[PDB]
Design a protein around this ligand. Structure first.
Ligand SMILES: NC(=[NH2+])NCCC[C@@H](N)C(=O)O
Ligand SMILES: O=C(O)CCC(=O)C(=O)O
Ligand SMILES: [Fe+2]
Length: 308
């Protein structure tokens, strides 16, 4: 078996989806414009029916850590070289695939971005940046990107994180782990459900159903409340259990994954960057089931969050 739910497009389905994305790229100026933001969820209804059925049904299954869609064609010649920085990463070659990711995303919920992250962009970029190999951000490489809940610090964090692989020639693995429910004892579990952790006022790591908890943790940034040694020991145990159950998902060129940000943490294995124009490159997007949950952080009329 596999801990994620997987769908493979037929060449015909893939072609139709790509064709729809190209039409959108033709008619709208940008993915993040107010117009396409509002229309994309409706335009997505024109995607291949088998895909729409998968996305509607798989989202409601209780078990998977992510929804994975394989088989979108990507032409390296048409795509062009991997950008050196996210600033200049909205290349014409990657433009139709950015529109494609937002269409798929519209089947799962409401897309949004952060004012403090990549200039408030909704479709963002994951690529190695020279000089930043050993950082704690997605533009790292030689240092493994440790497992984490996306934007764990915030209550406005995404329900789903979407990743579309534009290229990944060396097969660098994304990492994933669910709640280690098969090994967490009930005392530790109880403590993880209490507001005794920092990620700043204290908050909980686990919430909701005890037989299927939601997760809010960051391998690097999580800490116990000052002096709380029971909270500390629970977090220590959780680290070692997550470290031991961490598994690999390789997003090959054209693969899209929608990681369940409440069920699973994720990261990326260390890799040696090339810096020759064909480095691993993903497009990325935050999705929430309910945009109104974060109405505090609404900058204004935009879909870009910014609290104080
Ligand atoms: N490294 C770590 N444990 N946590 C921070 C991850 C930041 C990543 N989502 C980003 O760069 O957008
Ligand atoms: O590179 C990856 O596959 C993971 C990227 C990631 O964790 C992120 O951008 O939030
Ligand atoms: Fe992440």
């Amino acid at each position: 078996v596999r801990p994620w739910s997987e769908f493979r497009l037929t060449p015909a389905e893939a072609a139709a989806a790509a064709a729809l994305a190209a039409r959108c790229a033709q008619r709208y100026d940008e993915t993040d414009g107010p117009e396409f933001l509002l229309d994309a969820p409706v335009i997505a209804h024109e995607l291949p029916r088998r895909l729409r059925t998968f996305m509607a049904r798989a989202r409601l299954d209780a078990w998977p850590h992510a929804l994975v869609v394989r088989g979108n064609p990507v032409d390296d010649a048409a795509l062009g070289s991997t950008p050196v920085h996210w600033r200049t990463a909205r290349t014409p070659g990657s433009r139709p695939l950015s529109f494609l990711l937002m269409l798929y995303a519209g089947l799962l919920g409401d897309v949004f971005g952060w004012a403090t992250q990549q200039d408030g962009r909704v479709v963002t970029d994951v690529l190695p940046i020279k000089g930043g190999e050993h950082t704690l951000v997605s533009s790292s490489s030689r240092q493994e990107l440790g497992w984490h809940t996306e934007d764990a610090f915030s209550p406005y964090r995404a329900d789903y994180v979407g990743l579309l692989s534009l290229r990944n020639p060396d097969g660098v693995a994304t990492t994933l782990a669910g709640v280690p429910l098969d090994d967490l004892d009930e005392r530790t579990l109880d403590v993880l459900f209490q507001e005794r952790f920092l990620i700043p006022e204290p908050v909980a790591i686990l919430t909701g159903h005890r037989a299927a908890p939601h997760l809010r943790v960051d391998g690097d940034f999580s800490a116990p409340a000052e002096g709380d040694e029971e909270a500390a020991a629970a977090l220590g145990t959780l680290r070692k259990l997550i470290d031991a159950s961490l598994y690999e998902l390789v997003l090959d060129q054209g693969d899209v994954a929608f990681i369940d940000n409440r069920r699973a943490v994720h990261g990326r294995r260390a890799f040696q960057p090339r810096y020759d124009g064909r480095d691993r490159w993903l497009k990325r997007i935050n999705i929430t089931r309910d945009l109104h949950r974060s109405r505090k952080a609404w900058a204004g009329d935009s879909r870009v969050l910014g609290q104080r």
